[PDB]
Amino acid sequence: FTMTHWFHRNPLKATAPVSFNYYGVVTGPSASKICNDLRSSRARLLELFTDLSCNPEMMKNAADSYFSLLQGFINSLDESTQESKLRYIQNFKWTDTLQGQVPSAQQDAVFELISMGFNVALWYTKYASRLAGKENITEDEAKEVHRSLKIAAGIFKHLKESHLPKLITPAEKGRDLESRLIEAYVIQCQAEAQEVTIARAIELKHAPGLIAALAYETANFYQKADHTLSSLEPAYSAKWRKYLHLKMCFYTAYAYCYHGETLLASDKCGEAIRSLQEAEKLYAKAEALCKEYGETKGPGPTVKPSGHLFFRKLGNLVKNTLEKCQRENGFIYFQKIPTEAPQLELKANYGLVEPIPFEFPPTSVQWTPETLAAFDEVKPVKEP
Template structure:
């Protein structure tokens, strides 16, 4: 099985030591900052490996959240945000522009946003890693399904809670709401794919399979529409991937809707529907060809080579012939010149975003350590960071890309699964 999922890069970041200078007056403050730096390094190292268990990543993330939140929320609850919010000056690259100009902000929420974004990306990569195995167990399939919904939950959290905290909109970046919408819908669509494969494997009613496939296509359509608002030179490959998957699942929806109509004795309409099934398949072929040519980033993806897609034309032909044969021998119904509209909705199995159990409670040490920070010097520290940034820009180093994350590669099996769906996950 070759790679079926389009994946962007993890966000790269420069090393940050949480050295806040004279703002930290005593040892308890410096110790807390030192621990924050260590936990940041530990988390970033952990998510470079997609095979790590989800529990380990969430544990590491929560340990870091308990410290970084002290720079965000006020310990006395008298103000919306901590006076230390601007102390954390970090540099992050975008997942869609790994070699592009990094974004630098003196903002703890930007750090929180970027870390949660990276963990969401890790969940998508973890799902792809587990799905790459030759034989995927039922528990592993559940892991993939949950991981993709969790990724959608984290992206949705950023979209609904933290996106509006930024005063500056950065188009064609990970801070672009269109990019978040694309990630949310792609994650849900891929989770939905597992449901479709399982429904096929368990031989559920054709109407249910058609509805699930149709809903999956709609998720991919929403992903593509969000990416339409972005620069095609940045997201070109990603958009073609969403189009490929959209048309692939539209075609599957037509096939199983035709099966459903035939079961209900509507053979003439079934024949008309099956004639339509080839149109989205041909569109998927074109999108796959364009995927290899357009600009944009991707980590070695070859979705048209996947068994699930390669089996589609044969499925269309067999089902079409079956409907023609049954109509000719039994029903003798007139085939409509216009196929029935694909008005099918899944009643069950629709994927929804799911947030992991995040711990935003402050580390107990913050209660005593906060008073050890000299908040009167925060502005001075921020101005100093700003001056250093300008000096770096003048010297030509500020906008240099940070070193890309050395991600552990995901290797897929080349063996086709011996089942009905053509998917190892079902």
């Protein structure tokens, strides 16, 4: 019915156009075909990243077209020879999410594949956040938000697992093509996916125990993401870590809050009060982090967190639940309020999200030992 989320998004990656022309070395009509298609499908894919018309199907479709043609430069047709003789033919320049307009370059097709794939995953996360903000979002759309976030995680995960080790020149800290940076995108994608799950479990009036456990695990996801970026230099990674940190605090708050409900239901009203008192602490901390995030410099979203409805819903919830617990303890239970916060040992039995497995398409049919034999400036991106 309604979705209230606030997602921080780093900028898209931008690349210098590639003609794919090598007039001298490319011989024959079909050898020209793949060079023309490589150019047009890459161009059409780069266009779709900013095309507001694009839906997941279209995106998967355009990525597959390009990727299937690109793998000719990387994978063997033989199903034997190590790698394509074309791997180091071209040079690809990409900006990176945390590095402003300062480009990195490699004459490695894998570098292109990973950088592009990274951008595709990134697009899915932006598609999700835009859609989650649609004014009269339908349930089938909210379901697609969840699914896009899981698709992004799987792509990120695949890149890191089975493509990043192939790179001849390792990427420096702060760069997108680095294990610690990708790992954090996987975790983040999972955690953002669980936010949607948590919202519904609350709208669908589920048991407070399940919600608290979901919220706790989500906070742990955000926490792990923050810790994974600890290595990076504050100059370019601080704004993003702030976000991850406030989400951790935010969902630890939801956890103490809903666990408080669980305690109340167990006639332990005094314990419930203490739980909720801890939640209002964490809510306050999350609000302080929202201000800091605003003050902190780095690439960022146009809508600031501090004062967002997302955070106001938690504040009201914590307030009501606390007051309800004090009301019950004042007139009925009369239990003592423990001095220390409860120890949250919560396991989410249902709702935990796993990335959606990602694979690149097969090498394009166009590639023939014959077609293979025939082989002898950044343009920035605009985001509303």
